[PDB]
Amino acid sequence: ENRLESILSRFDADWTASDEARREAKNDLFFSRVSQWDDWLSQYT
Amino acid sequence: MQIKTKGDLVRAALRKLGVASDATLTDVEPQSMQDAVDDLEAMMAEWYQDGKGIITGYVFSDDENPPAEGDDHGLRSSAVSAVFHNLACRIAPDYALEATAKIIATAKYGKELLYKQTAISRAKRAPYPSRMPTGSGNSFANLNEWHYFPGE
Amino acid sequence: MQIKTKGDLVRAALRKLGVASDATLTDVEPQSMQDAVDDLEAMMAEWYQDGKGIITGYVFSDDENPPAEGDDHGLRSSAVSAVFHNLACRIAPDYALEATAKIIATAKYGKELLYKQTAISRAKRAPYPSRMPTGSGNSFANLNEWHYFPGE
Amino acid sequence: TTSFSIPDVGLNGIFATQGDISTLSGLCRIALWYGVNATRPEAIGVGLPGQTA
């Protein structure tokens, strides 16, 4: 019944649905635009 | 197994050498027996290089419980022959002896058989380098942003 | 270990040689003990080349203490056999003797085991040369202007 | 050395960095110089509640 609740329900559904292709697209952007050594999760000493 | 103490190992070694046994009319002194037990302790300690050598299950005696002889050696049933053949080879020179070829061969075979399983255990492959990608066929990792292998 | 002192090492060496043991009814001659202890100290100082040789934990007796014999050698439990086998080899010519093949083989094996862990520790790789870049993949360094490795 | 704006409050300090002679290291220093002056103590006040006992 809440305007904000319905809006956020729609947004959450769309975000979760598009979460995969979006991740791949941002990875492509970073790879081709910032640096191709995208290893921020690997702990090197 | 009828060999259940350090002195039992030493007695087996002396019998193998032919110096002293249960059938001989002459026997070795208790001081020589304690010396042989010291030799056995030294040899096993040099094998087990503080955990980076031959792992056998041997238990090193402590000064609080006085006689090192009388303590169970703790070896598994398959290490006794190797241990006491190597002990015979080691303590032969005290009695102006030289271990026979069969004793030397059985010592070599026993030591190698002792280390076989530990060698198999330590034959371990290193993890991938930190600079190696995980590929894209690893869909889960590449969705979770694990583009490169952890490493270490 | 029952071999806690330099004299214990020396007695073990003489027993290995078959000069003064209980298997042969001979007492350690007090003239032989001092010569063997001096040979042990010389050989240990030779091995430990002021820190750049074999590290064993042996403790060199100063001139202050009256008895060079009676003091703990300070070795590890896995160095005793190597030390006293090498000592028997070294002091055998004192008596116009020759340590047997088993004793010589055990001396070689023991010295190698003494140096093994130190060899592993000293197997160190030198850093990158001062003229090697870091590569642009090292983003933090190449942003903060660390384009080259320092070296040394 | 660059400028460095302290947020919320209206103040500006310096942000200076310099690397080491070797060993691929550095040093950072964020500095700010100021002094708080009460020109009218008779106009500043204090309220102390529960001043019994």
Side-chain angles (χ1 to χ4, degrees), chain C residues 4-30:
Chain C
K4 305 131 142 51
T5 37
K6 307 194 202 320
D8 288 4
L9 282 189
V10 167
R11 287 199 274 275
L14 300 174
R15 171 180 50 102
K16 294 332 310 193
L17 278 179
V19 158
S21 61
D22 209 340
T24 70
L25 304 137
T26 325
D27 301 329
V28 281
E29 313 194 319

PDB file of all heavy atoms in Angstrom, chain C residues 4-30:
ATOM      1  N   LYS C   4      74.834 -35.618  27.469  1.00  0.00           N
ATOM      2  CA  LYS C   4      74.600 -34.217  27.777  1.00  0.00           C
ATOM      3  C   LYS C   4      75.862 -33.373  27.819  1.00  0.00           C
ATOM      4  O   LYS C   4      75.754 -32.145  27.823  1.00  0.00           O
ATOM      5  CB  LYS C   4      73.885 -34.077  29.126  1.00  0.00           C
ATOM      6  CG  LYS C   4      72.600 -34.847  29.242  1.00  0.00           C
ATOM      7  CD  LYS C   4      72.563 -35.649  30.529  1.00  0.00           C
ATOM      8  CE  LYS C   4      71.171 -35.665  31.143  1.00  0.00           C
ATOM      9  NZ  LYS C   4      70.124 -36.065  30.165  1.00  0.00           N
ATOM     10  N   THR C   5      77.044 -33.978  27.853  1.00  0.00           N
ATOM     11  CA  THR C   5      78.271 -33.237  28.075  1.00  0.00           C
ATOM     12  C   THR C   5      79.321 -33.594  27.033  1.00  0.00           C
ATOM     13  O   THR C   5      79.255 -34.633  26.368  1.00  0.00           O
ATOM     14  CB  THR C   5      78.837 -33.499  29.467  1.00  0.00           C
ATOM     15  OG1 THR C   5      78.621 -34.866  29.818  1.00  0.00           O
ATOM     16  CG2 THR C   5      78.153 -32.630  30.485  1.00  0.00           C
ATOM     17  N   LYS C   6      80.304 -32.701  26.912  1.00  0.00           N
ATOM     18  CA  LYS C   6      81.417 -32.940  26.005  1.00  0.00           C
ATOM     19  C   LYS C   6      82.126 -34.243  26.343  1.00  0.00           C
ATOM     20  O   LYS C   6      82.580 -34.964  25.449  1.00  0.00           O
ATOM     21  CB  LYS C   6      82.391 -31.768  26.055  1.00  0.00           C
ATOM     22  CG  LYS C   6      81.751 -30.417  25.823  1.00  0.00           C
ATOM     23  CD  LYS C   6      82.808 -29.372  25.540  1.00  0.00           C
ATOM     24  CE  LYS C   6      82.320 -27.966  25.830  1.00  0.00           C
ATOM     25  NZ  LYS C   6      80.921 -27.761  25.401  1.00  0.00           N
ATOM     26  N   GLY C   7      82.227 -34.566  27.631  1.00  0.00           N
ATOM     27  CA  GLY C   7      82.796 -35.844  28.014  1.00  0.00           C
ATOM     28  C   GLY C   7      81.951 -37.020  27.595  1.00  0.00           C
ATOM     29  O   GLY C   7      82.485 -38.076  27.264  1.00  0.00           O
ATOM     30  N   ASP C   8      80.631 -36.865  27.611  1.00  0.00           N
ATOM     31  CA  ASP C   8      79.778 -37.917  27.083  1.00  0.00           C
ATOM     32  C   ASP C   8      80.040 -38.128  25.599  1.00  0.00           C
ATOM     33  O   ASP C   8      80.134 -39.270  25.130  1.00  0.00           O
ATOM     34  CB  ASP C   8      78.319 -37.568  27.336  1.00  0.00           C
ATOM     35  CG  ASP C   8      77.944 -37.697  28.788  1.00  0.00           C
ATOM     36  OD1 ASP C   8      78.845 -37.981  29.602  1.00  0.00           O
ATOM     37  OD2 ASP C   8      76.757 -37.511  29.119  1.00  0.00           O
ATOM     38  N   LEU C   9      80.187 -37.035  24.851  1.00  0.00           N
ATOM     39  CA  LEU C   9      80.527 -37.143  23.434  1.00  0.00           C
ATOM     40  C   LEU C   9      81.853 -37.867  23.246  1.00  0.00           C
ATOM     41  O   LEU C   9      81.986 -38.741  22.383  1.00  0.00           O
ATOM     42  CB  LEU C   9      80.602 -35.752  22.812  1.00  0.00           C
ATOM     43  CG  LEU C   9      79.303 -35.043  22.457  1.00  0.00           C
ATOM     44  CD1 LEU C   9      79.622 -33.795  21.672  1.00  0.00           C
ATOM     45  CD2 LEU C   9      78.400 -35.949  21.668  1.00  0.00           C
ATOM     46  N   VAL C  10      82.850 -37.503  24.048  1.00  0.00           N
ATOM     47  CA  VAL C  10      84.178 -38.085  23.912  1.00  0.00           C
ATOM     48  C   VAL C  10      84.159 -39.568  24.255  1.00  0.00           C
ATOM     49  O   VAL C  10      84.795 -40.384  23.578  1.00  0.00           O
ATOM     50  CB  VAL C  10      85.178 -37.318  24.788  1.00  0.00           C
ATOM     51  CG1 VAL C  10      86.462 -38.088  24.892  1.00  0.00           C
ATOM     52  CG2 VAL C  10      85.416 -35.939  24.227  1.00  0.00           C
ATOM     53  N   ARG C  11      83.455 -39.940  25.323  1.00  0.00           N
ATOM     54  CA  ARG C  11      83.355 -41.346  25.694  1.00  0.00           C
ATOM     55  C   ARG C  11      82.644 -42.143  24.616  1.00  0.00           C
ATOM     56  O   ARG C  11      83.032 -43.276  24.313  1.00  0.00           O
ATOM     57  CB  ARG C  11      82.626 -41.488  27.022  1.00  0.00           C
ATOM     58  CG  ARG C  11      83.422 -41.069  28.225  1.00  0.00           C
ATOM     59  CD  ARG C  11      82.819 -41.664  29.476  1.00  0.00           C
ATOM     60  NE  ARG C  11      81.750 -40.832  30.008  1.00  0.00           N
ATOM     61  CZ  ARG C  11      81.942 -39.801  30.817  1.00  0.00           C
ATOM     62  NH1 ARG C  11      83.152 -39.458  31.223  1.00  0.00           N
ATOM     63  NH2 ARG C  11      80.894 -39.099  31.233  1.00  0.00           N
ATOM     64  N   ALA C  12      81.591 -41.573  24.029  1.00  0.00           N
ATOM     65  CA  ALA C  12      80.924 -42.245  22.925  1.00  0.00           C
ATOM     66  C   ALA C  12      81.866 -42.439  21.749  1.00  0.00           C
ATOM     67  O   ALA C  12      81.853 -43.489  21.104  1.00  0.00           O
ATOM     68  CB  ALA C  12      79.690 -41.456  22.499  1.00  0.00           C
ATOM     69  N   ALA C  13      82.683 -41.430  21.442  1.00  0.00           N
ATOM     70  CA  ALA C  13      83.631 -41.559  20.339  1.00  0.00           C
ATOM     71  C   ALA C  13      84.656 -42.652  20.609  1.00  0.00           C
ATOM     72  O   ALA C  13      84.970 -43.459  19.724  1.00  0.00           O
ATOM     73  CB  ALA C  13      84.327 -40.225  20.095  1.00  0.00           C
ATOM     74  N   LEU C  14      85.187 -42.697  21.831  1.00  0.00           N
ATOM     75  CA  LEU C  14      86.160 -43.728  22.177  1.00  0.00           C
ATOM     76  C   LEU C  14      85.529 -45.113  22.150  1.00  0.00           C
ATOM     77  O   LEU C  14      86.180 -46.088  21.763  1.00  0.00           O
ATOM     78  CB  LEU C  14      86.771 -43.437  23.543  1.00  0.00           C
ATOM     79  CG  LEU C  14      87.517 -42.107  23.662  1.00  0.00           C
ATOM     80  CD1 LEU C  14      87.950 -41.866  25.089  1.00  0.00           C
ATOM     81  CD2 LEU C  14      88.710 -42.070  22.734  1.00  0.00           C
ATOM     82  N   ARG C  15      84.262 -45.222  22.550  1.00  0.00           N
ATOM     83  CA  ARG C  15      83.575 -46.507  22.464  1.00  0.00           C
ATOM     84  C   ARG C  15      83.348 -46.926  21.016  1.00  0.00           C
ATOM     85  O   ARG C  15      83.548 -48.094  20.666  1.00  0.00           O
ATOM     86  CB  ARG C  15      82.254 -46.447  23.220  1.00  0.00           C
ATOM     87  CG  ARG C  15      81.388 -47.650  22.992  1.00  0.00           C
ATOM     88  CD  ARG C  15      80.097 -47.537  23.755  1.00  0.00           C
ATOM     89  NE  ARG C  15      79.443 -46.254  23.536  1.00  0.00           N
ATOM     90  CZ  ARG C  15      78.415 -46.073  22.721  1.00  0.00           C
ATOM     91  NH1 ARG C  15      77.897 -47.074  22.029  1.00  0.00           N
ATOM     92  NH2 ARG C  15      77.892 -44.858  22.598  1.00  0.00           N
ATOM     93  N   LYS C  16      82.928 -45.991  20.159  1.00  0.00           N
ATOM     94  CA  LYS C  16      82.806 -46.293  18.736  1.00  0.00           C
ATOM     95  C   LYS C  16      84.119 -46.822  18.192  1.00  0.00           C
ATOM     96  O   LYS C  16      84.145 -47.809  17.451  1.00  0.00           O
ATOM     97  CB  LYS C  16      82.404 -45.041  17.949  1.00  0.00           C
ATOM     98  CG  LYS C  16      81.023 -44.404  18.188  1.00  0.00           C
ATOM     99  CD  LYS C  16      79.854 -45.286  18.647  1.00  0.00           C
ATOM    100  CE  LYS C  16      79.653 -46.538  17.821  1.00  0.00           C
ATOM    101  NZ  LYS C  16      78.345 -47.165  18.122  1.00  0.00           N
ATOM    102  N   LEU C  17      85.222 -46.172  18.555  1.00  0.00           N
ATOM    103  CA  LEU C  17      86.538 -46.607  18.107  1.00  0.00           C
ATOM    104  C   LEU C  17      86.968 -47.913  18.752  1.00  0.00           C
ATOM    105  O   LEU C  17      87.885 -48.565  18.246  1.00  0.00           O
ATOM    106  CB  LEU C  17      87.569 -45.530  18.417  1.00  0.00           C
ATOM    107  CG  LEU C  17      87.656 -44.388  17.421  1.00  0.00           C
ATOM    108  CD1 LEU C  17      88.708 -43.418  17.896  1.00  0.00           C
ATOM    109  CD2 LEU C  17      87.984 -44.923  16.046  1.00  0.00           C
ATOM    110  N   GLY C  18      86.345 -48.301  19.860  1.00  0.00           N
ATOM    111  CA  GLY C  18      86.773 -49.490  20.565  1.00  0.00           C
ATOM    112  C   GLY C  18      88.062 -49.314  21.325  1.00  0.00           C
ATOM    113  O   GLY C  18      88.874 -50.240  21.381  1.00  0.00           O
ATOM    114  N   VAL C  19      88.286 -48.138  21.897  1.00  0.00           N
ATOM    115  CA  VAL C  19      89.489 -47.853  22.662  1.00  0.00           C
ATOM    116  C   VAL C  19      89.230 -47.956  24.156  1.00  0.00           C
ATOM    117  O   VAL C  19      90.019 -48.547  24.892  1.00  0.00           O
ATOM    118  CB  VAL C  19      90.044 -46.463  22.277  1.00  0.00           C
ATOM    119  CG1 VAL C  19      90.915 -45.904  23.375  1.00  0.00           C
ATOM    120  CG2 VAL C  19      90.824 -46.550  20.983  1.00  0.00           C
ATOM    121  N   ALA C  20      88.115 -47.402  24.624  1.00  0.00           N
ATOM    122  CA  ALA C  20      87.803 -47.365  26.049  1.00  0.00           C
ATOM    123  C   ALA C  20      86.295 -47.504  26.216  1.00  0.00           C
ATOM    124  O   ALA C  20      85.564 -46.513  26.151  1.00  0.00           O
ATOM    125  CB  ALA C  20      88.313 -46.077  26.678  1.00  0.00           C
ATOM    126  N   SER C  21      85.833 -48.726  26.447  1.00  0.00           N
ATOM    127  CA  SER C  21      84.408 -49.006  26.540  1.00  0.00           C
ATOM    128  C   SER C  21      84.195 -50.024  27.653  1.00  0.00           C
ATOM    129  O   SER C  21      85.049 -50.220  28.524  1.00  0.00           O
ATOM    130  CB  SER C  21      83.865 -49.480  25.184  1.00  0.00           C
ATOM    131  OG  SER C  21      84.507 -50.669  24.774  1.00  0.00           O
ATOM    132  N   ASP C  22      83.019 -50.644  27.663  1.00  0.00           N
ATOM    133  CA  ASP C  22      82.735 -51.772  28.535  1.00  0.00           C
ATOM    134  C   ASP C  22      82.643 -53.090  27.787  1.00  0.00           C
ATOM    135  O   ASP C  22      82.858 -54.143  28.386  1.00  0.00           O
ATOM    136  CB  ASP C  22      81.428 -51.538  29.296  1.00  0.00           C
ATOM    137  CG  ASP C  22      81.409 -52.228  30.632  1.00  0.00           C
ATOM    138  OD1 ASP C  22      82.196 -53.173  30.827  1.00  0.00           O
ATOM    139  OD2 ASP C  22      80.616 -51.820  31.500  1.00  0.00           O
ATOM    140  N   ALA C  23      82.319 -53.053  26.493  1.00  0.00           N
ATOM    141  CA  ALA C  23      82.430 -54.249  25.668  1.00  0.00           C
ATOM    142  C   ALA C  23      83.862 -54.755  25.649  1.00  0.00           C
ATOM    143  O   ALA C  23      84.108 -55.958  25.524  1.00  0.00           O
ATOM    144  CB  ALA C  23      81.944 -53.954  24.252  1.00  0.00           C
ATOM    145  N   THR C  24      84.820 -53.843  25.749  1.00  0.00           N
ATOM    146  CA  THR C  24      86.213 -54.167  25.999  1.00  0.00           C
ATOM    147  C   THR C  24      86.592 -53.527  27.324  1.00  0.00           C
ATOM    148  O   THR C  24      86.346 -52.336  27.526  1.00  0.00           O
ATOM    149  CB  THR C  24      87.106 -53.641  24.880  1.00  0.00           C
ATOM    150  OG1 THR C  24      87.155 -52.213  24.945  1.00  0.00           O
ATOM    151  CG2 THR C  24      86.552 -54.043  23.532  1.00  0.00           C
ATOM    152  N   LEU C  25      87.191 -54.302  28.219  1.00  0.00           N
ATOM    153  CA  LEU C  25      87.388 -53.816  29.579  1.00  0.00           C
ATOM    154  C   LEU C  25      88.477 -52.760  29.648  1.00  0.00           C
ATOM    155  O   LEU C  25      89.570 -53.023  30.157  1.00  0.00           O
ATOM    156  CB  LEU C  25      87.742 -54.968  30.510  1.00  0.00           C
ATOM    157  CG  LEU C  25      86.743 -56.108  30.525  1.00  0.00           C
ATOM    158  CD1 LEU C  25      87.486 -57.421  30.515  1.00  0.00           C
ATOM    159  CD2 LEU C  25      85.863 -55.975  31.741  1.00  0.00           C
ATOM    160  N   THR C  26      88.192 -51.563  29.157  1.00  0.00           N
ATOM    161  CA  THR C  26      89.153 -50.474  29.170  1.00  0.00           C
ATOM    162  C   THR C  26      88.510 -49.233  29.765  1.00  0.00           C
ATOM    163  O   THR C  26      87.359 -48.913  29.461  1.00  0.00           O
ATOM    164  CB  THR C  26      89.671 -50.175  27.761  1.00  0.00           C
ATOM    165  OG1 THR C  26      89.759 -51.394  27.015  1.00  0.00           O
ATOM    166  CG2 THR C  26      91.045 -49.535  27.827  1.00  0.00           C
ATOM    167  N   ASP C  27      89.253 -48.543  30.617  1.00  0.00           N
ATOM    168  CA  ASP C  27      88.812 -47.281  31.185  1.00  0.00           C
ATOM    169  C   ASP C  27      89.372 -46.125  30.366  1.00  0.00           C
ATOM    170  O   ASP C  27      90.473 -46.205  29.820  1.00  0.00           O
ATOM    171  CB  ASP C  27      89.262 -47.150  32.641  1.00  0.00           C
ATOM    172  CG  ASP C  27      88.726 -48.259  33.520  1.00  0.00           C
ATOM    173  OD1 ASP C  27      87.621 -48.764  33.237  1.00  0.00           O
ATOM    174  OD2 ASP C  27      89.411 -48.623  34.499  1.00  0.00           O
ATOM    175  N   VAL C  28      88.598 -45.045  30.283  1.00  0.00           N
ATOM    176  CA  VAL C  28      89.045 -43.865  29.554  1.00  0.00           C
ATOM    177  C   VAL C  28      90.265 -43.289  30.259  1.00  0.00           C
ATOM    178  O   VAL C  28      90.217 -42.960  31.449  1.00  0.00           O
ATOM    179  CB  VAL C  28      87.920 -42.828  29.441  1.00  0.00           C
ATOM    180  CG1 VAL C  28      86.948 -43.217  28.346  1.00  0.00           C
ATOM    181  CG2 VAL C  28      87.180 -42.694  30.763  1.00  0.00           C
ATOM    182  N   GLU C  29      91.371 -43.185  29.536  1.00  0.00           N
ATOM    183  CA  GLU C  29      92.576 -42.629  30.127  1.00  0.00           C
ATOM    184  C   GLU C  29      92.421 -41.122  30.300  1.00  0.00           C
ATOM    185  O   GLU C  29      91.987 -40.429  29.371  1.00  0.00           O
ATOM    186  CB  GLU C  29      93.792 -42.934  29.261  1.00  0.00           C
ATOM    187  CG  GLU C  29      93.872 -44.375  28.805  1.00  0.00           C
ATOM    188  CD  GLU C  29      95.226 -44.737  28.239  1.00  0.00           C
ATOM    189  OE1 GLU C  29      95.806 -43.914  27.500  1.00  0.00           O
ATOM    190  OE2 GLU C  29      95.703 -45.854  28.525  1.00  0.00           O
ATOM    191  N   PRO C  30      92.749 -40.587  31.477  1.00  0.00           N
ATOM    192  CA  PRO C  30      92.624 -39.138  31.677  1.00  0.00           C
ATOM    193  C   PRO C  30      93.501 -38.326  30.744  1.00  0.00           C
ATOM    194  O   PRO C  30      93.197 -37.155  30.489  1.00  0.00           O
ATOM    195  CB  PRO C  30      93.029 -38.957  33.144  1.00  0.00           C
ATOM    196  CG  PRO C  30      92.827 -40.292  33.764  1.00  0.00           C
ATOM    197  CD  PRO C  30      93.162 -41.281  32.705  1.00  0.00           C
TER     198      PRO C  30
END
